[PDB]
Symmetry: C2
Subunit: 67 residues, 2 copies
Amino acid sequence: GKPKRPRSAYNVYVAERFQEAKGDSPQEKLKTVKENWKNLSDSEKELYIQHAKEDETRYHNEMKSWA
Amino acid sequence: GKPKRPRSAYNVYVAERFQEAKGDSPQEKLKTVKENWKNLSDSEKELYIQHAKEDETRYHNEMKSWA
Ligand SMILES: [Cl-]
Ligand SMILES: [Cl-]
Ligand SMILES: [Cl-]
Ligand SMILES: [Cl-]
Ligand code: NA
Ligand code: NA
Ligand code: NA
Ligand code: NA
């Protein structure tokens, strides 16, 4: 099957943090994570982005190999 | 506003080629482009992917700068 584009750094962060985020409803948990992404340190941001970049490089290689 | 994730190489190709693709309906034009992406040369594939990678690097920088 066609390789799948990996999740962005911003979406990895929102998803990974959602389950423990709190409080009151899924809407409210999402709202707070989106705030938390905004207030990450530069070095934490940098780490999320580097991990996503690595996954994107793998995806690029897979597209080029894909039959 | 929040930086927008750039379009993937595969989606750039499908979109850019759609208008002149032919023939008979939008569905059929899409179906044919998707076929054409599959049969690109390695070097043409490589070029699309490098252009998308450049846009993704710019997006990474913009996220890291974004206030
Ligand atoms: Cl990203
Ligand atoms: Cl990607
Ligand atoms: Cl891509
Ligand atoms: Cl990206
Ligand atoms: Na830091
Ligand atoms: Na990963
Ligand atoms: Na080639
Ligand atoms: Na571009």
